[PDB]
Nucleic acid binder design. Structure first.
Ligand SMILES: [Zn+2]
Ligand SMILES: [Zn+2]
Ligand SMILES: [Zn+2]
Ligand SMILES: [Zn+2]
Lengths: 680, 1298
RNA sequence: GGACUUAAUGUCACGGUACCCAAUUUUCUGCCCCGGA
């Protein structure tokens, strides 16, 4: 009686304090825990003689608990589903009880409807659409239409109008309600009266307001789902809503989290695919003026480069961030707390320099790659500086992936003896992309820059074979350079010295003729080099070569390291420490297959240490795509020591880079070298 | 067209699942997970019977896999007949996809064929495939097949086709553990079947083309595994448990009727523990009984159940059942009691439960790929086997769940948790090491050896290509079962309250462990082209040889040091699979016969198997030198204990027949040689106490122990010791006694009792005894232990650990129980010479800094200079005429000051004091401290039966004084000084003269009753010395003999160092409260005199026909002896320390009384303070310092100021006042009782004795008239005058009130 | 012999460690004089 009432009042005070958006996520958990402890203590005694208010409070507390649990591994966790199920089961007996009041049933139906809406949102098999529709209709029949004072009934009405149940009688009250936001009003105008002017008017305001909200918010997910639903109905306004949302996201993303960070909500790939498709479709229309078509094709590459500019890591990797002095204390903590606060806020209240794409030196051609998962087609956008024109083309990639998987599986078992699958892979690359050997697409005798995409980063595009009787290789006509993204290019003037530095740390002296040459500098650590010696170069040398092993982390690219005579040096440590490598050419012997993990899917965005070197002022990195023997690396090092302005493609051409018909091992050993970076 | 019959036999426990149709299988998750298991279907409705019917599609899949492997090992040929590559792809159009789709790789070669296979001709590979036939995706005839496989049925050999599921299978839970945190998640469950009784299946294979028989017959013999086990293919009741549940409920109800519900768990554990003693403990009535009383006792075996005792009820239950056996009966009774108690009783509040996640059988559209792999031509393939033994170095534990929740075919909510935790066994009660745990440990070690790896994913559309998985897909292990089948032991654990340093109520939990020294078989197989070096590193890491430990951690509870194994007797062989394939197929790979291979001589090996000689050494492997060896470090040390040690065991005191109150702990050790449990136990200290001491020390040092909760905490204590989110980074082991054979008698018997405050005698039914280990200052005990530290520790945590070690070395944390009276004090610690050098450097440098001893400026005797005026009555009588009374009473109150703001134990307050006091002990009259354990210690009872005789207290032959007596003697004085309550008081007793109103407890004032709760507050005596609900803040130690003249040798008849005492009997209270209206007078104190001289000459005519056996004989020490003891304190305010120092030495002319024979003048002692040290736990860790008297005098002045403030009168001001203690009335009355009138040569020798009886007493002389018929009658001495006289000091009793 | 009980040109389940956190201990001096009918 009085004791139960007093305990219930204390629990409700705690819950109402926890519902305040001014609180922090740390204290909310403890407050909810104390409230649940009080309710369970009361229940363990008055199991059967309990009133409905206690059950309603317990269901509300479990609904609150379900919000504080965040995903960790790209999959919806099971604790969220368990909490929602327990809340529903707790409210079911209060519904089944024979009290006979009105407000009691009204509040119980409100809380059950919101719990079921959330449970259906995160899981569909356990809660079907028909069950939700029946429950919502039954709750509406009880009179849960107080749009002027509560938001949950507004949510119920919006969910009902999404399913197709008519709501003409309450439209005026819903629009008059002050608590409703622009997205809900746009949905009401669209799904009820089949009107588009007011829907556009309010959707523009919603998209403009999205510019200031972090991507952890549920408004982004709701807007992208609404755009997807509009597209699925063969409507018209999605082709502009997608572009506006893309613009808002591109503006918002520039928040400078370690200069490159991302939250990874589940979408943000479907939105970019839809924007790319809409721009391509509105570009394929026939207009007499060609300037609009050129602008649209340029915007396609702009969208591609905006997508490829950053990578995203999961929450469990963000919690285990290794500590540093300056960046770790400020930026990681600020970004993480801001993201968490934005995530938990929507469930309580309802309210250098980037270069231009056309700044390429005379005589160069740039090729952009995009892999559209939505329509299942590939793309390739080329820009010709000498003619100032834009072109694009399409291809299929569902069998090149299978051939690549076969090559990888055979290589990971028989390194040098799997050379008969590399030839097949190169021939498949040549057959799938016939526009690489066309004069209208790529003019012959010109330098080519490659900007690949998800699984094309690991294909030797420079060793293609033309689909004919005795077709030539791609490297016998052009010179090739690689770049993970166009945003990694920078202006650079080579005011460099003439010092050559060597660093080496091996278990055994595989290189003996090397380290005895008299051309090395005065700060070489030729045997037993450590991570502290890499940070001591201050004179901006001309050529730095590091010989060591590799170590890849399969989850966090920041923890990838080079094996030196110490604890090692990692991706983050190079960015934080090394400052004396501005304008210097770097030669690496780390066999990229050891620096990055193998792939088991179409997409990956694992950055190598070459990007870390490029971000601190290096002008170019040279390495091997797979594992070869030390004699080839030694020969490359001597050939580069003799002079430094020579081109790599001639070296690959004169040393058996075209003997795939006769001796496949020579081809395998010779085409493993490529240069990363763009000279300006 | 010939039909063959084949048989399939298992050698391991296989797996089973329920049968569903192809369409209905999609609804379940376990059914989709177990598509490669054996099947089970029901026979009836609501039934418990069925059959097992392993299908032919699984056998066909295994056979074609074997065919593919055999063809690949020979470049696509068999007996000179080439074969093509086959076909493993079907178009989605013009047909339908088959039922199971492939996901792994496929081995391919060069076809080398002239004709394309068709309907008219084919190679044996295409014949074995059902490629060109009349049979397709729909079964029609059963005759169109050129090769057919049927279902395989279990051989029910005996009878009763009604086969129950509970008779064949059992349930178990398996989990997945996160590599980084060390905590598991998303478990799952399965079924396991018995392979010893149900292990043979029979089927048929039909072949209608003789062109593939030669290959089919070899492929049948090349199959190694099926359904999760190794195999071979050859071509030919309610009444019991229900009645015990009813009896358990009756017992529980009977216990509940008397309000004793909390003893049910103890009863259950005690009953379960009886399985190690046999039926003779219940048939011959060997259970322990009461100490003194047989009725109304505190025991549990004598609690009435339905009008009869409990021991008899258990005897009748055993005589009634007598069929299941002793072990099963005890186990089931204990389980029923535990379950009933757990259900009835209904802390660690939990909101959500655990998650059961099954690897989803992933499906998609357009996601199937064909990935061929072609091995090089000319390469060779081998096969390696390893055989050995696994030896347990510590007690191990493999966890299972409650048997009432693992029944196959069977299974608003609140979360309730069990606290029993049994261990894994098989059906014959032998210890088991499952394959899954060993595989998990091997994967965990391989990932560490490689330096990288992947977190296991369960979707699996494309199989992983990382370094660990490639090698893991080539390794096969085997199940292991021992040859030992005796019951295990149970270990208890509790939790302490950081605020009061007492046991938290409701925190008991136990677990079962196996013995140390057991051995298990070991088998490993690897098939490939090259033997890896990481696996060699792991094998060398798991092996012990000549100065190396074994580092294989298996199972759970690694934080407390459970489950460390070692590998021994290793042999490695080799199969050649290119030239000797026929011998490999003929011998079946020696599957199931590895036991005979372990003991086989090298001259009996089968053809094709040779020893392996290129196995690398420990120091030649680059791994294990930079990845595995520096993983864990070791610290080993010895502890010296120079005092009795008692780590109590609570169940052995209930089950053993010794009839003892508190005994020590010991464990069982298995001996490999001679194959038996050793016939003697070993005393040790459990690793949980070892861990808790370090945890508490560090927590008090950093202040993390006073927090509220550690849910998402990242404090220093949570980083070092872990929490419910991450495992620990330090692992502890046991401390074992190593010099126990040097002692003539390892255990000692000691007795204790509580003394009343009013009557001065011992309290009824309050005596207790202990059995500690016999440690002494000149013969200590040696204990040896170790712990392990993980790499990567910071520079501050190492310093914290070394500081904890130093604090333990300095005697700040005693071991065991009863540490406040001198038990288990540490005298030193020695570190081994193999520990890391920096650890010893830190121990030496970070040692507590050396105090600067002052150059004897004020370092002499700390003498309290204060002379009491004494009493004027004996000073004016210099001819010794008066006769005094042996005891008087002290009356004060009734106003007791209580404090509700008590001081906690969880931190070192900066403004409080902590330190150590050293002092001596002179004696002024002969002292008697008996050794009660032996009632015939002088061997005089043979001639005089019934004459008790003792000797002086000693341990190992060294004279000592126990610390309990010192503590009690000081506590009584402190209570009297500060006006506290009566701690020990006889409550319920009545009076009768020659019926009264109330009892003795009813006439005592309510303010003088002992403190009973922390909510009302504590008086100074209970606040300083402690209570049941609050630990005291002072500790006293034993006192050892230093010097002195000799015994009290006197020239008599029987041993010269003894003395026959007089009669000593029965203090009676009805002499100070004569007629039914008087309150108790108060505390009783005795006087100082030399009445012992009269008895030394009255001996001999004391012995002769005066007392037959009423008196006793004992050894007596002379005067002039010196002893020494120590006192410890912590967190004391300044006035408390001042009062402690004042009551420990009240000045000159004042002494204490101690021992037996106080009314006769025995036992006058005087204590002087020798030194005083103090430390303070601050940021810089200030060292030990020696205080001057310039601070001691201030402390005493502050104590005096506190006393005069408690006096309540503002007329007496407070400030800097010279302390004259005789100003306070009650202190003035107290110091007269403790006055020594013969300290200096001012003899003033008084005369004190009790009055004799009426007129005919033995020692009465005519004259004085000092009998009880004169000063005992209300005619010459009124009652009020009598009370006034006996409640007053001197001014004697002889004439009267002179 | 058949059924309960398979489907056939495609089964990595030896693809997953019942794992993680808690001091059997706090308080007590082996002491002792006046009456039984
Ligand atoms: Zn064939
Ligand atoms: Zn892997
Ligand atoms: Zn903590
Ligand atoms: Zn008290």
């Amino acid at each position: 009686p009085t004791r139960e009432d007093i305990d219930r009042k204390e629990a409700e005070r705690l819950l109402d304090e926890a519902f305040n958006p001014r609180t922090k996520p740390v204290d909310r958990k403890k407050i909810i825990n104390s409230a649940l402890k009080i309710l369970i203590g009361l229940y363990k005694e008055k199991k059967d003689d309990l009133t409905s208010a206690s059950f309603i409070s317990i269901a509300r507390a479990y609904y609150l608990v379900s919000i504080t649990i965040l995903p960790k591994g790209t999959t919806i966790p099971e604790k969220k589903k368990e909490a929602l199920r327990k809340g529903i089961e707790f409210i079911d007996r209060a519904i089944n009880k024979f009290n006979g009041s009105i407000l009691d049933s009204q509040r119980a139906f409100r809380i059950k409807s919101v719990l079921s809406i959330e449970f259906n949102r995160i899981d569909r098999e356990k809660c079907d659409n028909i069950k939700l529709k029946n429950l919502l209709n039954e709750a509406v029949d009880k009179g849960c239409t107080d749009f002027d004072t509560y938001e949950w009934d507004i949510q119920i009405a919006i969910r009902l109008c999404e399913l197709g149940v008519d709501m003409e009688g309450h439209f005026d009250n819903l629009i008059k309600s002050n608590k409703a936001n622009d997205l809900q009003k746009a949905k009401a105008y669209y799904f009820i009266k089949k009107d588009d002017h007011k829907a556009k008017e309010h959707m523009d305001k919603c998209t403009a307001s999205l510019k200031y909200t972090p991507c952890s918010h549920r408004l982004w997910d709701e807007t992208v789902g609404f755009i997807e639903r509009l597209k699925g109905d063969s409507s018209t306004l999605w082709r502009d809503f997608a572009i506006k949302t893309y613009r808002s996201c591109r503006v918002q993303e520039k928040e400078t989290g370690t200069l490159r960070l991302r939250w990874y909500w589940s979408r943000h790939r479907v939105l970019y695919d839809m924007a790319f498709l809409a721009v391509k479709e509105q570009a394929d229309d026939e207009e007499p003026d060609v300037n609009v078509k050129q602008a649209k094709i340029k915007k396609l590459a702009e969208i591609s480069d905006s997508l490829k500019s950053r990578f995203s890591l999961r929450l469990s990797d963000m919690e285990k961030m290794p500590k540093s002095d300056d960046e770790s204390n400020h930026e990681f903590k600020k970004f993480l707390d801001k993201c968490v606060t934005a995530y938990q806020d929507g469930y309580v209240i309802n309210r250098a320099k980037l270069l231009e794409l056309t700044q390429v030196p005379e005589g160069w051609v740039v090729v952009h790659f995009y892999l559209n998962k939505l329509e299942g087609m590939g793309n390739a956008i080329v820009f010709d500086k000498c003619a100032n024109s834009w072109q694009y083309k399409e291809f299929q990639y569902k069998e090149l992936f299978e051939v690549f998987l076969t090559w990888q599986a055979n290589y990971n078992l028989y390194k040098e003896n799997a050379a008969e699958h590399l030839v097949t892979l190169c021939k498949k690359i040549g057959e799938t992309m016939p526009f690489l050997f066309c004069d209208n697409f790529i003019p012959n005798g010109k330098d080519v820059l490659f900007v690949p995409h998800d699984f094309l980063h690991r294909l030797p595009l420079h060793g293609s074979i033309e689909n004919k009787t005795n077709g030539k290789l791609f490297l016998e006509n052009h010179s090739c350079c690689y770049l993970p993204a166009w945003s990694f290019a920078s202006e650079k003037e080579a005011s460099t010295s003439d010092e050559y530095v060597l660093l080496k740390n091996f278990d055994q002296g595989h290189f003996e003729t090397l380290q005895n040459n008299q051309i090395w500098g005065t700060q070489s650590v030729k045997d037993g080099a450590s991570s502290d010696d890499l940070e001591n170069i201050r004179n901006n040398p001309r050529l730095l070569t590091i010989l060591c092993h590799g170590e890849a982390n399969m989850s966090n690219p920041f923890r990838s390291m080079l094996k030196l005579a110490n604890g090692g040096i990692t991706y983050l440590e190079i960015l934080n420490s090394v400052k004396g490598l501005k304008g210097s050419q770097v030669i690496l012997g780390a066999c990229e297959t050891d620096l990055v993990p193998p792939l088991s899917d179409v997409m990956d965005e694992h950055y190598s240490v070459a990007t870390a070197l490029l971000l601190i002022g290096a002008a170019g990195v040279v390495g091997t795509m797979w594992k070869v023997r030390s004699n080839k690396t030694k020969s490359l090092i001597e050939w580069k020591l003799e002079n430094i302005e020579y081109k790599l493609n001639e070296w690959q051409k004169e040393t058996g880079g075209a003997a795939y018909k006769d001796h496949p091992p020579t081809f395998y050993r010779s085409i493993a070298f490529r240069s990363i970076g763009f000279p300006l | 067209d010939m039909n063959i019959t084949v048989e399939l036999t298992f050698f391991e426990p296989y797996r089973l699942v329920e049968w569903f149709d192809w369409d209905a299988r999609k609804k379940s998750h376990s059914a989709m997970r177990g598509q490669a298991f054996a099947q089970w279907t029901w026979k009836g409705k609501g039934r418990t019977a069925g059959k097992s019917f392993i299908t032919g599609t699984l056998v066909r899949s295994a056979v074609i896999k074997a065919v593919e492997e055999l063809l690949s090992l020979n470049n696509g040929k068999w007996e000179g007949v080439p074969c093509c590559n086959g076909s493993f792809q079907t178009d989605e159009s013009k047909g339908k996809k088959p039922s199971f789709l492939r996901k792994r790789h496929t081995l391919q070669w060069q076809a080398n064929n002239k004709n394309i296979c068709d309907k008219e001709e084919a190679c044996p590979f295409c014949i074995l495939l059902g490629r060109f036939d009349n049979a397709g995706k729909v079964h029609e005839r059963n005759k169109d097949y050129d090769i057919h496989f049927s279902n395989f049925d279990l051989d029910h050999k005996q009878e009763k086709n009604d086969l129950r599921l509970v008779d064949i299978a059992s349930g178990r839970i398996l989990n997945r553990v996160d590599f980084d945190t060390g905590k598991a998640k998303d478990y799952f469950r399965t079924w396991e079947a018995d392979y010893e009784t149900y292990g043979t299946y029979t089927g048929r294979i039909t072949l209608r083309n003789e062109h593939a028989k030669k290959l089919l017959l070899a492929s049948l013999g090349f199959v190694d595994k099926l359904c999760g086990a190794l195999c071979r293919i050859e071509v030919i009741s309610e009444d019991h448990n229900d009645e015990l549940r009813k009896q358990a409920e009756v017992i529980v109800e009977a216990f509940k009727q008397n309000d004793k519900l909390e003893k049910i768990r103890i009863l259950a554990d005690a009953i379960r523990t009886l399985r190690l003693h046999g039926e003779g403990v219940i048939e011959k009535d060997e259970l322990p009984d009461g100490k003194e009383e047989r009725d109304k006792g505190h025991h549990l075996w004598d609690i009435k159940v339905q009008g009869t005792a409990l021991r008899t009820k258990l005897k009748e239950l055993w005589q009634s059942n007598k069929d299941i056996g002793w072990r099963k009966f005890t186990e089931m009774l204990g389980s029923n009691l535990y379950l009933i108690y757990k259900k009835e009783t209904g802390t660690r509040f939990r909101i959500l439960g655990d998650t059961e996640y099954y690897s989803k059988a992933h499906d998609s559209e357009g996601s199937d790929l064909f990935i061929p792999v072609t091995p090089p031509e000319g390469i060779e393939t081998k096969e390696w086997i390893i055989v050995g033994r696994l030896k347990a170095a510590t007690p191990f534990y493999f966890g299972v769940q409650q048997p009432s929740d693992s029944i196959p075919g069977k299974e608003s909510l609140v979360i309730n948790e069990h606290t029993s935790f049994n261990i894994l066994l098989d059906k014959e009660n032998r210890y088991r090491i499952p394959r899954s745990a060993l595989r998990g440990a091997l994967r965990r070690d391989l990932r560490t050896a490689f330096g990288s790896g992947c977190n296991v994913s369960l979707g699996g559309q494309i199989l992983c290509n990382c370094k660990v998985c490639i090698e893991m897909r080539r390794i096969t292990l085997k199940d292991s079962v021992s040859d030992f089948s005796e019951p295990p032991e149970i270990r208890y654990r509790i939790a302490k309250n950081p605020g009061t340093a007492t046991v938290e109520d409701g925190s008991l939990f136990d677990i079962e462990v196996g013995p140390e020294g057991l051995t298990f078989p070991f088998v490993l197989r690897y098939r490939g082209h090259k033997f890896p070096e990481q696996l060699s590193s792991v094998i060398r890491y798991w092996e012990e040889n000549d100065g190396k430990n074994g580092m294989a951690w298996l199972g759970g509870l690694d934080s407390t040091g459970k489950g460390r194994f070692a590998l021994k007797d290793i042999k490695i062989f080799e199969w050649d699979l290119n030239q000797k394939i026929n011998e490999y197929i003929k011998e079946r790979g020696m599957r199931g016969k590895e036991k005979e291979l372990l003991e086989m001589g090298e001259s009996s090996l089968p053809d094709g198997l040779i020893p392996y000689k290129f196995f690398e050494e420990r120091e030649c492997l680059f791994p294990y030198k930079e990845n595995l060896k520096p993983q864990w470090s070791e610290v080993q040390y010895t502890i010296e204990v120079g005092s009795p040690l008692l780590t109590a065991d609570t169940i052995s005191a209930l089950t053993e027949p010794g009839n003892r109150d508190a005994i020590a702990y010991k464990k069982r050790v298995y001996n490999d040689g001679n194959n038996a449990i050793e016939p003697e136990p070993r005393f040790a200290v459990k690793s949980e106490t070892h861990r808790g001491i370090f945890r508490t020390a560090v927590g008090r040092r950093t202040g993390d122990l006073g927090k509220e909760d550690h849910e998402d905490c990242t404090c220093d204590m949570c980083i070092i010791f872990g929490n419910e989110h991450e495992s620990s980074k330090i692992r502890f082991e046991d401390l074992e006694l190593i010099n126990g054979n040097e002692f003539e008698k390892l255990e000692k018997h000691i007795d204790h009792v509580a003394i009343d405050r009013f009557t001065g005698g011992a309290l009824d039914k309050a005596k207790f005894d202990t059995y500690p280990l016999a440690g002494s200052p000149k013969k200590p005990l040696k204990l040896k232990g170790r712990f392990w530290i993980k790499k990567g520790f910071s520079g501050d945590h190492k310093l914290l650990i070394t500081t904890a070690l130093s604090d333990i070395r300095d005697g700040l944390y005693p071991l065991g129980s009863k540490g406040g009276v001198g038990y288990g004090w540490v005298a030193g610690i020695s570190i081994d010479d193999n520990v890391p050098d920096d650890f010893k450097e830190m121990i030496n440098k970070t040692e507590m800094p050396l105090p600067e001893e002052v150059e004897e400026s004020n370092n002499g005797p700390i003498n309290n200079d204060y002379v009491h005026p004494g009493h004027q009555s004996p000073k004016q009588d210099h001819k010794n005429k008066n006769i005094y009374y042996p005891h008087y009473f002290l009356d004060s109150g009734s106003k007791v000051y209580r404090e509700k703001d008590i001081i906690t134990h969880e931190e070192f307050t900066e403004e409080l004091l902590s330190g150590k006091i050293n002092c001596k002990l002179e004696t002024l009259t002969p002292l008697i401290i008996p050794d009660t354990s032996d009632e015939n210690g002088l061997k005089l009872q043979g001639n005089k039966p019934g004459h008790k005789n003792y000797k002086f207290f000693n341990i190992n032959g060294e004279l000592m004084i126990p610390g309990s007596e010192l503590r009690g003697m000081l506590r009584t004085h402190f209570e009297a000084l500060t006006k506290s309550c009566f701690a020990i008081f006889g409550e319920d007793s009545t009076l009768s003269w020659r019926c009264a109103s109330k009892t003795l407890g009813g006439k005592l004032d309510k303010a003088l009753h002992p403190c009973t709760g922390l909510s009302d507050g504590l008086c100074p005596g209970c606040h300083l010395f402690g209570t049941t609900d609050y630990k005291g803040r002072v500790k006293f130690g034993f006192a050892k003999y230093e010097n002195g003249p000799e015994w009290l040798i006197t020239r008599g008849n029987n041993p010269e160092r003894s003395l026959t005492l007089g009669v000593l009997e029965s203090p009676r209270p009805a002499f100070s409260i004569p007629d039914d209206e008087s309150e108790i007078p108060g505390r009783k104190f005795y006087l100082h005199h030399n009445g012992w001289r009269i008895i030394r000459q009255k001996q001999l005519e004391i012995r002769e026909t005066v007392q037959p056996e009423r008196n006793v004989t004992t050894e007596v020490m002379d005067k002039g002896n010196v002893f020494s003891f120590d006192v410890r304190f912590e967190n004391l305010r300044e006035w408390e320390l001042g009062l402690l120092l004042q009551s420990l030495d009240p000045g000159k002319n004042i002494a204490h009384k101690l021992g037996k024979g106080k009314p006769y003048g025995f036992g006058s002692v005087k204590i002087k303070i020798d030194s005083l040290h103090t430390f303070k736990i601050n940021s810089n860790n200030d060292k030990i310092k020696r205080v001057p008297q310039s601070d001691i005098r201030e402390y005493i002045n502050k104590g005096y100021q506190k006393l005069i403030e408690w006096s309540g009168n503002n007329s007496i001001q407070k400030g800097n006042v010279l302390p004259q203690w005789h100003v306070i009335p009650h202190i003035d009355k107290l110091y007269k009782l403790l006055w020594v009138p013969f300290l200096n040569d001012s003899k003033l020798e008084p005369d004190v004795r009790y009055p004799v009886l009426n007129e005919e007493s033995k020692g009465y002389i005519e004259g004085s008239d000092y009998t009880y018929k004169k000063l005992g009658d209300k005619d010459n001495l009124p009652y009020k005058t009598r009370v006034k006289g006996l409640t007053t000091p001197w001014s004697p009793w002889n004439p009267f009130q002179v």
